[PDB]
Amino acid sequence: AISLIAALAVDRVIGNENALPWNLPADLAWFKRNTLNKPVIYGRHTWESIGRPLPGRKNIILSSQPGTDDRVTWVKSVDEAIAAAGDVPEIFVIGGGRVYEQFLPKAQKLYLTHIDAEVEGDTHFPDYEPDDWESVFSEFHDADAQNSHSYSFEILERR
Numbered sequence: 001a002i003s004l005i006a007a008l009a010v011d012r013v014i015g016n017e018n019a020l021p022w023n024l025p026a027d028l029a030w031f032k033r034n035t036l037n038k039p040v041i042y043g044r045h046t047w048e049s050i051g052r053p054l055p056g057r058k059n060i061i062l063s064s065q066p067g068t069d070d071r072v073t074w075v076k077s078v079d080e081a082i083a084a085a086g087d088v089p090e091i092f093v094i095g096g097g098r099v100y101e102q103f104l105p106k107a108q109k110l111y112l113t114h115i116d117a118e119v120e121g122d123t124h125f126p127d128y129e130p131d132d133w134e135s136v137f138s139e140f141h142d143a144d145a146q147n148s149h150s151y152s153f154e155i156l157e158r159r
């Protein structure tokens with residue numbers, strides 16, 4: 001089954017021109033624990049942002065442009081990306097915006113981090129109908145010595 005994971009600032013903005021103005025190691029830990037040892041799908045731009053494959057995970061990159069690396073799997077379509085992932089219980093889509101958009105219709109779960117930050121950004125997470133989804137988990141955290149902003153984790157399951 002397909003799962004989407006993302007960190008959202010106020011107004012569902014997932015990023016912009018510049019680096020994100022928050023320090024949230026707690027979110028990174030949450031991200032690792034949920035995606036560890038599972039196939040992860042992402043686009044050309046996210047690849048460029050990280051530069052190297054994510055450890056212990058099966059990296060699948062959706063790109064219309066030919067692949068430039070042998071350590072990760074390169075696909076040209078959504079159907080091909082899902083096939084390259086295999087017959088595993090859970091497959092994660094980790095971005096970016098246009099990729100989340102193509103995968104939302106087929107997602108069964110949403111792992112969201114709601115960050116209390118007013119970030120003026122260009123890219124937004126797709127709008128999802130609240131009625132089509134059930135919030136089976138939500139946990140609120142305040143900012144602390146390690147995390148700069150207050151935030152909440154949420155797991156939604158498709159109805």
Ligand SMILES: Nc1nc(=O)c2nc(CNc3ccc(C(=O)N[C@@H](CCC(=O)O)C(=O)O)cc3)cnc2[nH]1
Nearest residue numbers: 005006007027028031032046050054055094095113
């Ligand atoms: N919750 C959530 N937080 C994110 O930061 C996030 N980032 C993406 C896409 N961008 C990125 C950028 C960097 C790494 C990365 O280098 N992660 C390392 C953790 C490093 C670490 O703390 O060891 C990883 O191994 O997962 C992953 C995704 C998608 N969904 C997200 N979702």
Ligand SMILES: [Cl-]
Nearest residue numbers: 043045046096
């Ligand atoms: Cl991307």
